[PDB]
Structure 1
Amino acid sequence: AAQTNAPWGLARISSTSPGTSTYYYDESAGQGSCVYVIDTGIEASHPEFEGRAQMVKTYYYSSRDGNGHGTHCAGTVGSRTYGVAKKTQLFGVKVLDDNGSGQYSTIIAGMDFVASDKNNRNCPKGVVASLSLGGGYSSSVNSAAARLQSSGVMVAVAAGNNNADARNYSPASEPSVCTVGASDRYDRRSSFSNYGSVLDIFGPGTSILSTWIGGSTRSISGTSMATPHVAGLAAYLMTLGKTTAASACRYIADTANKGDLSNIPFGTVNLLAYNNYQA
């Protein structure tokens, strides 16, 4: 399949070179997989989701996305024009209020929710969770994300936008999940992206165009925008049968574009998510 004039990050993840604008992918497109988006909620009624998005859980007075950030991330996972996995199922878990913040105990309770709720869902090709959130180091937040991974979900988390070692953040610093940094369209590490030995992979993070609340679109930047590129890729790759939840992060790292990014500090991996699809 070929989507012309695609957003640059989509084209990048199906390209050995920067600077192109067509996204190539196997038409299976994540059919039969499920991605949980744990964030401010999802405007499921957005036409870009085609009835494939829905809210399954909130810890606040509404499951509505009154922020946009969770909607934007879900759009990068699986919307028709901006999504990596254009046929996946999207499940929203509103752990962040409409200002984008949430207590760690609420965040922990949402991760434990997904590790159980997946048993209430039809996802024969596998389960992914995309956590575009984070704060300072917490062993209880790390262990919550470890548990979710352990239950059989591929967990993708953002490295953080502090331009610093991600060892001091959570769940970025948990080793058993997939910690994602951000790059830009010239294959530079995004200026805000955290780095360090705990990072596993880079995805497109700067000026990422996706769905927004109110039926609209907009372009924003952040390692929360790289994370859903990798989450969506995992779901896409599990549907093709090329990997499982437990080994998706390692498979993505093994098959990535090596050595293509600049301003990657010594000791950080130089790997860019790549679907390796040959049209």
Structure 2
Amino acid sequence: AAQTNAPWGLARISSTSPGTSTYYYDESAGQGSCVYVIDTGIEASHPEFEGRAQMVKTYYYSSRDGNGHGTHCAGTVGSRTYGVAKKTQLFGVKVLDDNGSGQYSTIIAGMDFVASDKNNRNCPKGVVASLSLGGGYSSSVNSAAARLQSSGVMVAVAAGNNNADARNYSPASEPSVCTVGASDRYDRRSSFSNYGSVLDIFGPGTDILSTWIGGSTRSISGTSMATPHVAGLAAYLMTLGKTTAASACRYIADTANKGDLSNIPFGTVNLLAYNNYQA
């Protein structure tokens, strides 16, 4: 399939070159996979989700997204226009308040929730979790991310937006999950993106158009925006049978565009997520 006039990040993950505007992908489109978006919630009623999104858990007075951040990330995973995996099922877990903040103890509870809740969902092709959040290093937060991964969920986490070494942030610093840095439309490391040996992959993160609350859309930037590209990519590849939750991060690194990004510090991977789709 080909989506013309796609957001640049979509076109980028199906391209060997920057500077194109069509997204190419296999029509299976993540059908039969599921992606948990652990964030501020999802506006599931947005027409862009086509009934494929739902809230499954909140730790606050509402499961509605009063911020927009979770809806934007969910849109990059799987919305019809802005999404990598356009037929995946989306499950929202609201661990962050409407100001985008959440306690680590709630975030941990949300991760253990997904590890169990996947057994209450139909995801024959596999399960992904997208975690566009983090704070300072915590071994308990990292351990929760490792349990979720161990349970058979492909965990993608944001590297963080401090222009710093991601070793000092969690869950970014957990080795067993997929830590995602941010790039821009000219194949430059995003100005804010964290870096370091713990990063596994980069995805599009600067000026990313996606869904927003109020049935709207907007373009925002962050490693929070790169992470759902990788999570949607994993769901898409698992539906194709090319990889599994346990192997998907290594597979995406194996199949990435290599050495194409600028301003990558020495010792940080120079790998850009790529679906390797041949139309």
SS in 1 for 2:148: helix
The answer to whether residue 181 in structure 2 is matched with residue 168 in structure 1 is no
- Counterpart of 2:221 in structure 1 is 221
Per the TM alignment, residue 208 of structure 1 is displaced from its structure 2 partner at its CA by 0.1
1:204-257 residue CA offsets vs partner (Å, 9 max, x unmatched): 000000000000000000000000000000000000000000000000000000
CA–CA distance in structure 2, aligned partners of residues 262 and 131 of structure 1: 25
SS in 2 for 1:190: coil
SS in 2 for 1:193: coil
Per the TM alignment, residue 161 of structure 1 is displaced from its structure 2 partner at its CA by 0.1
CA–CA distance in structure 2, aligned partners of residues 80 and 7 of structure 1: 12
TM-score under structure 1 length normalisation = 1.00
- Counterpart of 1:102 in structure 2 is 102
Per the TM alignment, residue 121 of structure 1 is displaced from its structure 2 partner at its CA by 0.2
Per the TM alignment, residue 188 of structure 1 is displaced from its structure 2 partner at its CA by 0.1
CA–CA distance in structure 1, aligned partners of residues 160 and 74 of structure 2: 18
Per the TM alignment, residue 259 of structure 1 is displaced from its structure 2 partner at its CA by 0.3
SS in 2 for 1:111: helix
Flag as ranges the 4+ runs of structure 1 deviating above 4 A.
none
SS in 2 for 1:36: strand
CA–CA distance in structure 2, aligned partners of residues 116 and 145 of structure 1: 13
Per the TM alignment, residue 15 of structure 1 is displaced from its structure 2 partner at its CA by 0.2
SS in 2 for 1:112: helix
Question: What is the RMSD computed on CA atoms of the aligned residues?
Answer: 0.2
Structure 1 unaligned residues grouped into runs of 5+: none
Per the TM alignment, residue 177 of structure 1 is displaced from its structure 2 partner at its CA by 0.1
CA–CA distance in structure 2, aligned partners of residues 163 and 93 of structure 1: 28
Per the TM alignment, residue 111 of structure 1 is displaced from its structure 2 partner at its CA by 0.2
TM-score under structure 2 length normalisation = 1.00
Structure 2 unaligned residues grouped into runs of 5+: none
CA–CA distance in structure 2, aligned partners of residues 163 and 50 of structure 1: 36
1:67-112 residue CA offsets vs partner (Å, 9 max, x unmatched): 0000000000000000000000000000000000000000000000
CA–CA distance in structure 1, aligned partners of residues 49 and 244 of structure 2: 25
Per the TM alignment, residue 2 of structure 1 is displaced from its structure 2 partner at its CA by 0.2
CA–CA distance in structure 2, aligned partners of residues 176 and 106 of structure 1: 21
Per the TM alignment, residue 130 of structure 1 is displaced from its structure 2 partner at its CA by 0.1
- Counterpart of 1:234 in structure 2 is 234
Percentage of identical aligned residues: 100
1:153-209 residue CA offsets vs partner (Å, 9 max, x unmatched): 000000000000000000000000000000000000000000000000000000000
Per the TM alignment, residue 114 of structure 1 is displaced from its structure 2 partner at its CA by 0.1
